Amino acid sequence: PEDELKRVEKLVKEAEMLLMLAKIKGSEKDLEKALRTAEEAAREAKKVLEQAEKEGDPEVALRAVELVVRVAELLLRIAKESGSEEALMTALLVAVVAATLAVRVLVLAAVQGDPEVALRAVELVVRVAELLLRIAKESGSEEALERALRVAEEAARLAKRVLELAQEQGDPVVAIAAVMLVKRVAELLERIARESGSEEAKERAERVREE
Amino acid sequence: PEDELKRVEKLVKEAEMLLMLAKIKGSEKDLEKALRTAEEAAREAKKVLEQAEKEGDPEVALRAVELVVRVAELLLRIAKESGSEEALMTALLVAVVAATLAVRVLVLAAVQGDPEVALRAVELVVRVAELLLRIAKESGSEEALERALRVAEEAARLAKRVLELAQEQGDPVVAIAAVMLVKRVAELLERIARESGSEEAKERAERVREE
Amino acid sequence: PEDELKRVEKLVKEAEMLLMLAKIKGSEKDLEKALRTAEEAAREAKKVLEQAEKEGDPEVALRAVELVVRVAELLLRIAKESGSEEALMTALLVAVVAATLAVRVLVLAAVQGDPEVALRAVELVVRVAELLLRIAKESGSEEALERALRVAEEAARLAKRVLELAQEQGDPVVAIAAVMLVKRVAELLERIARESGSEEAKERAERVREE
Amino acid sequence: PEDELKRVEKLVKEAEMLLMLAKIKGSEKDLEKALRTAEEAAREAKKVLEQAEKEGDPEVALRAVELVVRVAELLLRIAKESGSEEALMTALLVAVVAATLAVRVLVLAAVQGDPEVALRAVELVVRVAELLLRIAKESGSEEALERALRVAEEAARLAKRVLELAQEQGDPVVAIAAVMLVKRVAELLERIARESGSEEAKERAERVREE
Amino acid sequence: PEDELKRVEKLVKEAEMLLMLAKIKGSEKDLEKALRTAEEAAREAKKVLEQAEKEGDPEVALRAVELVVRVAELLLRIAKESGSEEALMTALLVAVVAATLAVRVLVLAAVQGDPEVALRAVELVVRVAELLLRIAKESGSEEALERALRVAEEAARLAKRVLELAQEQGDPVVAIAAVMLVKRVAELLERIARESGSEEAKERAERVREE
Amino acid sequence: PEDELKRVEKLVKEAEMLLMLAKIKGSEKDLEKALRTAEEAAREAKKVLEQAEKEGDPEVALRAVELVVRVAELLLRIAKESGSEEALMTALLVAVVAATLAVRVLVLAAVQGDPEVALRAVELVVRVAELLLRIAKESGSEEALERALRVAEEAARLAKRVLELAQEQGDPVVAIAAVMLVKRVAELLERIARESGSEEAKERAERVREE
Amino acid sequence: PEDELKRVEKLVKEAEMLLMLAKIKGSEKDLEKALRTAEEAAREAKKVLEQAEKEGDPEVALRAVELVVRVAELLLRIAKESGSEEALMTALLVAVVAATLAVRVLVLAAVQGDPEVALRAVELVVRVAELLLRIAKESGSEEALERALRVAEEAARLAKRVLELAQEQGDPVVAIAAVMLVKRVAELLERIARESGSEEAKERAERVREE
Amino acid sequence: PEDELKRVEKLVKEAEMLLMLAKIKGSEKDLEKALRTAEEAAREAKKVLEQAEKEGDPEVALRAVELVVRVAELLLRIAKESGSEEALMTALLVAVVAATLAVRVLVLAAVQGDPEVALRAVELVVRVAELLLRIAKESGSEEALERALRVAEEAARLAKRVLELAQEQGDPVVAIAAVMLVKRVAELLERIARESGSEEAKERAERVREE
Amino acid sequence: PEDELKRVEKLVKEAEMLLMLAKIKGSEKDLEKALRTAEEAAREAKKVLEQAEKEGDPEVALRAVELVVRVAELLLRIAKESGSEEALMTALLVAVVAATLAVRVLVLAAVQGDPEVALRAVELVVRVAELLLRIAKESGSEEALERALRVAEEAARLAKRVLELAQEQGDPVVAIAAVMLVKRVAELLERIARESGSEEAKERAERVREE
């Protein structure tokens, strides 16, 4: 049931409500249950995926996982208002998850032959990459920075795999978009390469800008 | 349904009718059921809010809460004719409620992006402040006096939060009105500061007149 | 609908017709159904008020109640031709009713802000007073005499309440008339004081002639 | 449903029709089924009360019971045309019933606070009294005569109880009527006292004329 | 609906048309369907009564029954042209019916208090009597002759019952007419007494000429 | 099921009906079964609590217990009409029960975090106190008087415990009301202190007026 | 319906009537309801626009908005007679509104291709500018002064946009008028530049006098 | 329902409104939601086609797809004002889509035998070709240039297929127009051949100018 | 359900759509799934027959089988565009099937007595014959040629059996048509006899032209 997705979505709104009230009247308990509501919202989000795998709906799978991204993003924000290393780590944990989950939404889209959803699954990986990057900035964690760049390249990589089941089904437009996707990853890696000395970003960009 | 609001409104009129007859023929039972009709009117008023939260109508929420203010105000008056400490305390209880309820109407207006309704929600807080002040005078309660001034400043405070989602939506006029709102609070606190020695009103006015 | 008022009015005319024929050909059955037609006319008259309360028409309310007075007055007359203690008591019952009903028409006129109709509602109380006085003479009932004088003073009293919502709406003429009303009550009570030894009328007149 | 009352009423009309035809063409079978139709009409009448108790309608209760009186009255008449001791006893049985049933309509009117209906319930007791008196004359039964006078006084008694919930609800007119009711009982008992030597009627009248 | 009466009436006209054509061109089939059309006309006529009983219209009842008389009269005539013992018996059957039906129209007129319609109902009985007399002459049936005289007296009898609800409603003119009605029955019975040796007519006339 | 509460409530109304009839016709058997109906009503009332404990509804718990108070109050009244020491003791027994039961409704409200219901539970204790006081006056029992004052103070005491889970949940209004509650207990104890020499009431009031 | 516009217009006249009477007899309540009538008139005015957007009538849109200007102008005047900072702020709020509303009437005129109405919409902006200037003088508000000059330049700016859809439709006359419009803005800004030291007006005039 | 088409159309107008306002006041958020409104308009446009396939309406199909072209064209324009590579790619994606969709509208027109709609479907392909050409110029993308020319020739090709079901249905005029269509493609390819060195356009024109 | 037939029919249209698109854009995969869609359409077609046997509908049976012919015919065409020996053999297999299936529709029509449907069943055999002939030409298969001629004669044969249950039910027209059917088979066999040297067609025509 996408009936659940609405549940998940409303939980998220509520978490955002608990956060928004929390900043207004300065309540550390609002912020706490906001964290917990978020956490629940994302738990259920993954229950919904897990059965959209054991069913045939990649559409449901994608909406579930992008809700999980939404939860991750909310966690990042709660972290910044709380100033909590914990909240920042849970933000990070939901982020690293969303990545491999998007990857699952993708492989489902391939098995079932739904190239437009696979594409979106790959974009989502990119979003997760961008989030990790954010988290990395907020925590100064040299590890989160590595995870980010990694996840980026791995999206650019899966883009080829999206183009590849595109060219099986004769749909050049999503396959062109699938190449446009690879170049905004090249670009992200280039934008990162410039600022923020990384002995890496340079290499990853160079070898994705080949692909 | 705003169909209910009309119910709530008519209950209130009736309560006012029972009060107005009560003063005319001097019936302590008219005054009693007037109190109880009022009380009901405000109960339902909050049922109506509670579902306007679980729905999307901040408009309904505001009309519900300002009816609750109306009920509070009626209770203050019934108190003064009865000379009841009880009626005065129930007046006070509906008043302290209306405050945090307006605050809820506000946070709903923010979540849903309705800055003109948020503004009115904040005015309402100010009205509640003014009511508390009245109640405080009638009961000589040194506590009600504190609640009043508090609630005032907290309205001036939320005014910034109204201006803040105003400047997100690019609506300077309600945001200007939102600054005009803060200065009639500064003024209320100044007007109170003068008469009625309060070691406080002075401070609150000084620090809101900064903001 | 004032469509009903015409119904009520025609019922009354018919009752008066049944009475007038009854005296002509000396029919005790004409007189009976005349009583019953009257009774109906007044029943409906009050149905019409009752909804003019639950609507916004004090105009309809007043015409309904003064029809009820008209019915009461007719009952007094039927009583005198029949020589019935019963008919005289039902005359009395519709009379004591009309009083508190006029009082309702009045409080409606106040809630809705219609000072000229309130005034007339108070006059009507006076008429009812005058009727009670009549009934009292016809039955020699020491109780009806008390009800009369009471109802009188209570009209003079409500006159202040008419003047009081007059001075809110800035209409000195009906408010002057509202003081002229109090003095013809003082006068009625004085006229009664003189003849018909009453240990009371004297007091009531003295204390209304203050007001 | 008052839908039933109309049923009960039409049954009664029909019974009266069967009676009226029966006298015209002299049919002892018309008179028989007239008795039985009557009997049914009153059965259902009490079913209708019984649920107006287990519901909240004293209005329905009163119309049901006064239909039962109507049935009783019809039975008295059928008795006189038939010359049946049986029909006269069933007349009596429905009469003695109607009494205690009116009493139930009354106590319902008290529980539910409907003083005008209680009043009518008490009048009804008086009617039943008057009926019993009739029945007593037709049967020369020294017992029916006792039941009559008894039931009379017991109505005058319940009149106080009507006045008593009148003075709780501040409705002096039905309470005055409630005293007028007691004096037509005093009167009935006086009218009976005179004719028809009864060592009793005298006492009952004396002690009710106190009350 | 009196809409039906027009139906019944037109059926009758048509039956009379089928009869009138039948005599002209000598068609035994015209005469047959004329009988059947008549029969229908009278069937519906009684359906119309039957619901005018279960409604409140004695006016409708009378027009229905006198149509039934009209049908009866038509049947008598068809009988005489056909020379049918059958048609004569069906003539007789509708005649004996119309009698007891008029009687029903009457008792309806009494229940509902419509003395002028009752009167006409009784006249109708007389007409039926006159018809029976005709039928009796045409068939030489010693039984039809008895039915006739019987029905006559029974009309004179019901005349008293018409006068009796006349004197309840104070309408001496229909009550005088109700006595004029009894004397044309006395007269009919006298006119029959003379010719046509009947050991009976004499007695019936003597005892109705008393009444 | 609150379906049961309605059962309990109707039993109570019926008990009150049996009592009200009992006073009217002076039936000691009505009064007896009124006692027993009351007793049942309160039995079931406690069954309903007992499962509202083993469920999560403090709302149901409170309505159940306040019905038990209602039953107690009815018993007090039946006692006074009967003049029974027994009925007065059973009145007392249901009263002393209701106290510790309210206390249970309270601790349920705490476990489940429902401060507004806890508050009402504490008021109820106060009502029970007031009842005990009544019972004490009617029986002159020096023991019932002690139980009363005790129960009073113990309510004032639990008020702190209500304020205490109020300040955990940040709801100052019920917590203010919770302090208003303590002062009407101080007041009750003061009102009792004055009249009715008690070497005690003085002390209890002094030490609660501290708190 | 332009049927509404007449409503709006008459409301405005009435407001002006309440104001004009208010100054004559010196009634602060006339002035109050004059403010409120004005306020309503402008509310409806915007309802009428809002549907002239969701319809195709820029003509209706312009008349609606210029009524809103009229309301704004009336508010300025009421402010000056009352001496109210509040009335002056509400004057200001309707003024700042009318500006962005005229802007909407304009963009509607563009979408629908009605260059003569767009022109008038831009003039209206200028009027609003002139009003703001007035308001600014009356309140000495350094902010209202900024809003004024701003709004002026923004009109001169939209004038180019009017000329631009003029030159698409080949209508040089409204386009010439559209350049004449820009120079009376240059002029207004110059007239303001001179008196009333503003470090700004100078710049705005210089850069619009380029355009 | 073509009721939807109007929806789609109005969405498009609104998008164009958001764009036109966006250029006027320079709002990057207007431009954003203009993009998104456009995107929606085209989503629904394809929902409408998708069911016009699963229904029998090629007329609905064509209007839906040409709305999709309209959306594509709007996207191209938004791209140029924003200077966004993203907006330009989404412009391109809706363009490449519209092509194969027109192709679907065509094959529907063939299955259902509607040669005039097929013709228009083929023109539409040509429009899409022209759009791609535009997009290609704006992005300098050597790939978009290939897609353009391709799509052109493929329209000229389907023109034969339009002529071919024309000659089945004996409609030479649309079939002549179908040959006129091929020559403006030859011409487009020739016009492109000249400017803008393409080693290709030459070949495609040569081999279509054969056909 | 003939609800299924529509399913079968739409599958066929779709197969034809996949074929028609396949020839347009030259897609060997369109042609493949067109074959498979066809194949399904015919599978279900036979499921529908199979239950129209186990039910009483020869009408359903005939529509099912002629859909199977339609599928066969489509397969022949797909074969010719693909140039597949396989597709041609599956064309042949559905053809040889349709024959013996028509034969079943026929024997059902006989058992159930529906001679007009039997006739059509026999025509269908002839169509199948004509198809086999086509297939035979396309494959040069000396075997398919034998099957064709065979199936032809066997239709002419069953024609006698159609005429034979015609003459049982007295319907000479379908029986005449049943003889007209035999002569277009004689004719088909004659037309084949001429061209395409067959040592056979001659004999079969000679011996059917006897019959």
Side-chain angles (χ1 to χ4, degrees), chain B residues 2-200:
Chain B
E2 294 179 354
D3 288 344
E4 182 65 21
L5 290 172
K6 289 179 181 178
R7 289 178 180 172
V8 171
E9 290 177 353
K10 290 180 180 178
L11 290 172
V12 171
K13 289 179 181 178
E14 185 173 7
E16 289 176 313
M17 285 178 74
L18 291 173
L19 178 61
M20 285 189 280
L21 286 167
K23 290 179 180 178
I24 288 170
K25 296 300 184 180
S27 171
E28 293 179 354
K29 293 296 180 178
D30 288 349
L31 290 172
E32 181 68 21
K33 291 181 182 295
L35 178 62
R36 289 178 180 172
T37 299
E39 289 177 354
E40 181 179 359
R43 181 187 66 197
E44 291 296 297
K46 185 173 183 293
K47 289 179 181 178
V48 171
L49 178 62
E50 290 294 352
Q51 298 299 308
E53 182 169 312
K54 298 296 184 182
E55 297 291 352
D57 292 342
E59 181 65 21
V60 172
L62 185 156
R63 290 177 66 194
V65 172
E66 185 175 27
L67 292 174
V68 174
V69 171
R70 182 176 178 181
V71 172
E73 290 177 354
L74 181 59
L75 290 172
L76 179 62
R77 289 182 290 168
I78 292 168
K80 288 176 70 69
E81 181 65 21
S82 66
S84 175
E85 293 84 28
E86 177 68 23
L88 291 173
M89 289 181 78
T90 299
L92 181 60
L93 173 60
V94 172
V96 172
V97 163
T100 59
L101 293 181
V103 169
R104 290 175 70 183
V105 172
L106 178 61
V107 171
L108 177 61
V111 66
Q112 295 304 306
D114 186 355
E116 291 178 354
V117 174
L119 179 62
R120 181 63 178 168
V122 173
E123 289 177 326
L124 291 173
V125 172
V126 171
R127 181 65 178 174
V128 172
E130 182 178 88
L131 179 61
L132 291 173
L133 290 172
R134 290 185 181 94
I135 292 168
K137 289 179 181 178
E138 291 296 323
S139 66
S141 174
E142 292 179 354
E143 292 178 354
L145 291 172
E146 182 179 330
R147 179 63 67 191
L149 290 173
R150 184 181 297 277
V151 171
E153 182 179 359
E154 290 184 354
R157 290 178 180 173
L158 293 172
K160 181 178 184 293
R161 187 179 297 277
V162 173
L163 184 154
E164 291 178 326
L165 298 176
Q167 68 183 352
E168 184 67 30
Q169 299 299 309
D171 188 355
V173 169
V174 299
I176 291 168
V179 174
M180 194 61 70
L181 185 155
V182 172
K183 294 183 185 185
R184 297 176 293 177
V185 174
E187 182 179 327
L188 179 62
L189 292 173
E190 290 176 326
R191 289 181 184 276
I192 293 169
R194 182 178 181 274
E195 296 293 352
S196 195
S198 178
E199 294 179 354
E200 183 177 359

